[PDB]
Structure 1
């Protein structure tokens, strides 16, 4: 084959499938708390669909448009869907910001949109700065086929894993050291795996740093609609609304996490740079969104009654579900980073480490997966600077199963501590 053709986050995931938990067929199975999915609000969608069958019937205004959709492969995207998307994104941001649909580019999921953005701004050998801890999938998405390098901006629990001027300069000094040409910074807001919204000061800090370095800022806002608690979610685009730096600020979105439709593969890129758009637009040809899905979500995201109620009901259920995990953890004497967003909790299990090393982290992880039968993501998998932290997903399973996981966890700790 070729070079391109030739961790724990992916292993635990594969182990889960080798022996998945089932409330009837396999009660001693592995419980999956390692995938950030949101299955809480399906009933609201399932209900709406069964009563609004026209979208799925390839019909518009009553008349069939099956032929038009079957042929639609325009890499510019279905216009009705792009408008519905930019309004939904505006609604999530309290309508404090507005997006132009001619500047929105659809992609098959955010996995496809992040890689695409890398291909547009960084040539092989070049580099991007990314705050750690970060989504484990980034190592694959952003590097495998682009040949670009990620230089970590380290963050510690000292200041709640926030981004500091110190970390930024330090990460950039590491780039210059390795003679790597830094093309930009890619941040996740709200943060995965932290489950925290970025503060306005962090945002201004990023905007200033990339203004002094003449580089790009990419904000992965896929969890923007999962901000179920104060403070408020602040889009990087809102911070620009209060010279030439805005042409270097970009947004990556997806309907995978707030709507819980990762299977439909709807992602997007939004940039103010007319050039980035045109190039990203052309690249979407490699991963367009099914026109069938575009038309369906175009009808759903157009029902302002459905979206207003969905957002409010999702925040509510997320918050309730989050407290149930926190309390379940507090029950075993385990604390979490104070999070107000995401579909997971960044958990502090340092006090359970044999030693302050990653080797010890690994060991604790193995036991949890092979003994407690729970799949969670270790912090080294997220490139966290300090051992002991784990990401635990709480919205990808039934409440009762969540309780079960907690019990198996309480037993374990009260079984070795």
Structure 2
């Protein structure tokens, strides 16, 4: 006999995933296999990092100027993190934001990925039975990260295509009211900026409306800016930290302490296996609580050392960002154009590793049953693994998310060809 969490509290949407695993596509021996376009991973700039590693072997050698510091690292288990790394991190975060804002390293707490940061924040801001508002459509992983062990609930703030899925004052108010009706105390709004799965940076207008709503309701604002480094085209990416500055919110504003940021190196630098997440808050109480909670998911000191060396190289960071935006824009343009050669268009995006594509016109009907229908035809007949919009809780059937940053151009082309032949009927 185990706990509720381990048993009856531990779907149709993994159909493409399992179908893919069973028949993975292969350039040579399985050219008709399923192509993976449902994995948000960035494999575009590993050459830049491999190159740097080759010219800078000391980092990964437990060294510092011909000096071994192995023993020192092996012993480092301070929940405040390696100072050098926290400094390099805060600088990198600033550089991503074009140095428009600066971060205090002491308000930054490292976690084993954003997955960890996501949950820890919830543990810090809400008790079981309370709720957090999240704009729809959203990262399906939130349904596990934010609620599994926290007992916290998610109330959706619905967005529709009528306005490019932007956040609305009416949607916010309505979501807040839906929570009250259910007798759930709203503790905050969690936003993904840039957005997964939309692929769009949040507008200043949306940000101001959020800040004012959060200020109005007296709740928190968590900005998951894990994709902040993948904004490859205008409009410019606006970090919530910038908006505070621009709305003239100094530490005298009450809201100034209710705005937090979540970040990670998994999506921009493509290092998900290294488990580097971070929490940033202006509230000392949250930093302290989150710092103690990070003990359940500390970042390997070996990794913290490697990355502090890497991220301390301003020549590399500056160049990685520029090269990463270049390669990502090129790639998105490719997918977007190949998609329209099939008559399919996408939500106009400027960030992320995926496109939110519009396939409503292919729906035999404007129902989610019709969307599941289309999705299956794509899985079984076109042999592509893509994500159905309903997976992300989209309110209108027919939208899909397709990734482009972890596929060789040749494969992307193949997928686009298969799509075109299929649409042909």
TM-score where L is the length of structure 2: 0.96
Residue 275 of structure 1 and its aligned partner are, at CA, apart by 0.2
Task: Assess if the C-alpha contact under 8 Å between 1:255 and 1:267 holds in 2.
Answer: yes
Which of 339, 348, 359 is matched with 2:358 structurally?
348
Residue 18 of structure 1 and its aligned partner are, at CA, apart by 2.5
Which of 218, 221, 227 is matched with 1:217 structurally?
221
SS at match of 1:107: strand
Between the aligned partners of 1:407 and 1:8, the Cα distance in structure 2 is 27
SS at match of 1:88: helix
Between the aligned partners of 1:160 and 1:333, the Cα distance in structure 2 is 19
Between the aligned partners of 1:143 and 1:55, the Cα distance in structure 2 is 38
Per mean C-alpha deviation after superposition, the further-off stretch among 202-211 and 7-16 is: 7-16
SS at match of 1:8: coil
Task: Assess if the C-alpha contact under 8 Å between 1:8 and 1:378 holds in 2.
Answer: no
Displaced runs of 4+ in structure 1, greater than 3 A? 7-11
Cα deviation, 1:58-95, whole Å, max 9, x if unaligned, reads: 00122000111111111111110000000000000000
RMSD of aligned residue pairs (Cα, Å): 1.1
Give the equivalent residue in structure 2 for 1:328: 338
Residue 12 of structure 1 and its aligned partner are, at CA, apart by 2.6
Query: CA, structure 1 residues 10+251, in 2 after alignment: closer, same or farther (shift >3 Å)?
Result: farther
For the pair 1:184 / 2:183, whether they are aligned, the reply is no
Between the aligned partners of 1:14 and 1:221, the Cα distance in structure 2 is 30
For the pair 1:33 / 2:40, whether they are aligned, the reply is no
Between the aligned partners of 2:161 and 2:12, the Cα distance in structure 1 is 22
Give the equivalent residue in structure 1 for 2:271: 261
TM-score where L is the length of structure 1: 0.98
Which of 1, 26, 37 is matched with 1:22 structurally?
26
Cα deviation, 1:385-415, whole Å, max 9, x if unaligned, reads: 1000000101011110100111111111113
Query: CA, structure 1 residues 183+249, in 2 after alignment: closer, same or farther (shift >3 Å)?
Result: same
Cα deviation, 1:363-403, whole Å, max 9, x if unaligned, reads: 11111112211111110000001000000101011110100
SS at match of 2:312: coil
Residue 16 of structure 1 and its aligned partner are, at CA, apart by 2.3
Between the aligned partners of 2:22 and 2:154, the Cα distance in structure 1 is 32
Residue 11 of structure 1 and its aligned partner are, at CA, apart by 4.1
Between the aligned partners of 1:310 and 1:60, the Cα distance in structure 2 is 24
Cα deviation, 1:95-121, whole Å, max 9, x if unaligned, reads: 000000010010111011001101111
Aligned residues: 415
Residue 277 of structure 1 and its aligned partner are, at CA, apart by 0.4
Task: Assess if the C-alpha contact under 8 Å between 1:9 and 1:136 holds in 2.
Answer: no
SS at match of 2:196: coil
Query: CA, structure 1 residues 264+321, in 2 after alignment: closer, same or farther (shift >3 Å)?
Result: same
